[PDB]
Amino acid sequence: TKEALAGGKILHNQNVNDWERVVVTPTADGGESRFDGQIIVQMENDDVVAKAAANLAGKHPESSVVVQIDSDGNYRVVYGDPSKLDGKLRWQLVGHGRDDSESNNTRLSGYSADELAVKLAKFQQSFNQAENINNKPDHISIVGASLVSDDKQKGFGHQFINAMDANGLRVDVSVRSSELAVDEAGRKHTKDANGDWVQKAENNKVSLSW
Ligand SMILES: O=P(O)(O)O[C@H]1[C@H](OP(=O)(O)O)[C@@H](OP(=O)(O)O)[C@H](OP(=O)(O)O)[C@@H](OP(=O)(O)O)[C@H]1OP(=O)(O)O
Ligand code: NA
């Protein structure tokens, strides 16, 4: 059964050292990725979020690093080796989207688009300093429900791509206007107009670029 990343329970994003850690099970049918490595960034201490982050890493088990990061900016690596992060990198940000508006959700794991950009910019420098690694992403995949407007023209993803650039991270951003879930193979599902979970519905996502 799919569990949406659309909120519904209380946000717990503080004190990373007190978060659950879940097992990543490598799946062997992940195929090829354009990214040489990736960071899965788990943004809150919630079972749906933690499982989704672990399942994404399991799709590319040899080149994925999972980080948990809290409201104070403290982070820890819970899967993978940062030394694999060389080349064309993606970050997949995993959290619940919440706080609806005319342009859909306004917060991912409690963070506005501006706040999220600041957090990620600090994290890039902290991670690079502590791990001695350039983790600079080319692409951010926002793995949370309904973080761009239905027509794909407004909302969180648009404010986020600009705020990221303002904070020194020029990235492409993929983001979904619908509810979103991650399955046991690390593949994403969105909800269609009928409320049914589907895969590869390109109409539910947009890739914002420069
Ligand atoms: O090649 P596929 O097996 O079809 O997997 C794709 C691919 O991810 P991989 O890197 O794991 O191959 C996409 O990556 P892009 O190069 O297009 O960026 C990703 O898109 P996002 O990066 O935007 O997350 C997409 O996810 P989506 O379902 O949202 O299209 C995902 O497909 P799966 O969901 O089946 O893993
Ligand atoms: Na692929």
Author numbering: 3583 to 3792
Task: Please give sentences taken from the publication describing this entry.
To examine the activated conformation of the unprocessed CPD upon InsP6-binding, we crystallized the pre-processing form of CPD (here referred to as pre-CPD) bound to InsP6 using the catalytically inactive mutant C3727A. We determined the 1.3Å crystal structure of the CPD-InsP6 complex capturing the scissile bond harbored in the active site. The N-terminal five residues (TKEAL, 3583–3587) upstream of the scissile bond were ordered in the crystal structure. The side chain of the scissile residue Leu3587 is inserted into the catalytic pocket formed between catalytic residues His3678 and Cys3727. The Cβ atom of the mutated Cys3727Ala points toward the amide bond of the scissile bond, which represents the conformation ready for the catalytic reaction. The backbone of Leu3762 in β9 makes a hydrogen bond with the amide nitrogen of the scissile residue Leu3587. InsP6 binds to the conserved basic pocket located distal to the substrate binding pocket. Three positively charged residues, Arg3769, Lys3770, and Lys3782 of the β-flap make ionic interactions with InsP6. The β8-β9 loop of the β-flap interacts with the β7-α3 loop locking the catalytic residue Cys3727 in an active conformation. The binding affinity of InsP6 to the pre-CPD C3727A was 1.4 ± 0.5 μM measured by isothermal titration calorimetry.
V. vulnificus secretes a large multifunctional-autoprocessing repeats-in-toxin (MARTX) as a main virulence factor via an atypical type I secretion system. The central region of the MARTX toxin of V. vulnificus MO6-24/O contains an autoprocessing cysteine protease domain (CPD) and four effector domains including the domain of unknown function (DUF1), the Rho-inactivating domain (RID), an αβ hydrolase (ABH), and makes caterpillars floppy-like domain (MCF). The CPD directs the proteolytic processing of effector modules after activation by binding to the eukaryotic cell-specific inositol hexakisphosphate (InsP6). The V. vulnificus MARTX CPD displays a canonical CPD structure with the central seven-stranded β-sheet flanked by three α helices.
